[PDB]
Amino acid sequence: TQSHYGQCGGIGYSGPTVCASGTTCQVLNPYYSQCL
Ligand SMILES: *[C@H]1O[C@H](CO)[C@@H](O)[C@H](O)[C@@H]1O
């Protein structure tokens, strides 16, 4: 899972897409999504 302020899963990202407990994957940009 991705940590707080980490890139969860935007377009082009293939790593830890599921955010940690208490954080939501906020799509800041189509490619940049951050666990907030
Ligand atoms: C991601 O996996 C779980 C998701 O809730 C977290 O509890 C864990 O700490 C890790 O960051």
Short mmCIF file of C-alpha atoms and ligand atoms in Angstrom, two decimals:
data_model
loop_
_atom_site.label_atom_id
_atom_site.label_comp_id
_atom_site.label_asym_id
_atom_site.label_seq_id
_atom_site.Cartn_x
_atom_site.Cartn_y
_atom_site.Cartn_z
CA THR A 1 0.00 0.00 0.00
CA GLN A 2 1.07 3.59 -0.53
CA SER A 3 1.83 5.91 2.34
CA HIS A 4 0.50 9.41 3.05
CA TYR A 5 1.83 11.94 0.47
CA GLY A 6 2.94 9.16 -1.79
CA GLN A 7 1.81 8.63 -5.36
CA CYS A 8 -0.95 6.05 -5.20
CA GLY A 9 -1.96 5.31 -8.71
CA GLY A 10 -2.17 7.75 -11.49
CA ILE A 11 -1.85 7.00 -15.19
CA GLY A 12 1.61 5.60 -15.78
CA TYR A 13 2.09 4.42 -12.24
CA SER A 14 2.13 0.69 -11.58
CA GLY A 15 3.22 0.54 -7.94
CA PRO A 16 1.24 0.56 -4.64
CA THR A 17 -2.08 1.99 -5.74
CA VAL A 18 -4.03 1.26 -2.58
CA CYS A 19 -3.55 3.94 0.02
CA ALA A 20 -2.87 3.25 3.66
CA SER A 21 -5.50 3.40 6.36
CA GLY A 22 -6.76 6.92 6.81
CA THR A 23 -5.60 8.18 3.45
CA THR A 24 -7.48 8.50 0.20
CA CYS A 25 -6.04 8.35 -3.32
CA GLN A 26 -6.69 11.89 -4.46
CA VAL A 27 -6.21 12.48 -8.13
CA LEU A 28 -4.25 15.73 -8.21
CA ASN A 29 -3.46 15.27 -11.87
CA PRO A 30 -4.26 12.45 -14.37
CA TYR A 31 -0.81 11.00 -13.83
CA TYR A 32 -0.19 12.21 -10.32
CA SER A 33 -2.45 10.84 -7.69
CA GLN A 34 -1.52 11.16 -4.04
CA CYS A 35 -2.61 9.39 -0.87
CA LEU A 36 -4.10 12.09 1.24
C1 LIG B 1 -0.91 -0.19 3.62
O1 LIG B 1 -1.77 -1.28 3.86
C2 LIG B 1 -2.74 -1.04 4.92
C3 LIG B 1 -4.00 -0.45 4.28
O2 LIG B 1 -4.95 -0.07 5.26
C4 LIG B 1 -2.12 -0.12 6.00
O3 LIG B 1 -2.73 -0.36 7.25
C5 LIG B 1 -0.65 -0.42 6.12
O4 LIG B 1 -0.13 0.39 7.16
C6 LIG B 1 0.05 -0.05 4.81
O5 LIG B 1 0.47 1.28 4.94
#
